[PDB]
Structure 1
Amino acid sequence: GSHSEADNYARELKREQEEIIRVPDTEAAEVAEILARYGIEPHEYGPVVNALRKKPQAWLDFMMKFELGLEK
């Protein structure tokens, strides 16, 4: 039986959104840590992390592409 490239991503998209809902602060922290890898200081990344928090699908996209390294 079949393993769609659709199924794997929807399987990962589910997990991640259940993660945004159940522990949203932890997920913000994951964005901080990715940006702070690039010597970007909290005063500089703070507002970007915040700006994602308010646009949950964009924030979800950003985990998907930049935390997990998967695409649509």
Structure 2
Amino acid sequence: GSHSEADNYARELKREQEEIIRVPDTEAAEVAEILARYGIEPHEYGPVVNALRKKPQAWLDFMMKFELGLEK
């Protein structure tokens, strides 16, 4: 049967959301490590990682785009 472009993204969205709920500090470490790739130091990237944790839907969007390479 079908494979909706909608369905693939909802499949990938669901998996990532469940990781944020079950292992949030691990997901926060994924952000830190992406930003550290560009020689940004913890004292510099820290507040961005903290800003995302406080906005779970934005944090989920950020992972979808910058960890998984996906768009809406």
Give TM-score scaled by structure 2 length.
0.99
- Aligned length in residues: 72
Q: CA deviation at 1:3?
A: 0.4
RMSD: 0.3
Q: CA deviation at 1:42?
A: 0.3
Query: Could you list the runs of 5+ residues in structure 1 that have no partner in the other structure?
Result: none
Q: Distance in 1 between matches of 2:18 and 2:43?
A: 29
Helix, strand or coil for the counterpart of 1:3? coil
Q: CA deviation at 1:61?
A: 0.1
> Identity over aligned residues, as a percent?
100
Give TM-score scaled by structure 1 length.
0.99
Query: Could you list the runs of 5+ residues in structure 2 that have no partner in the other structure?
Result: none
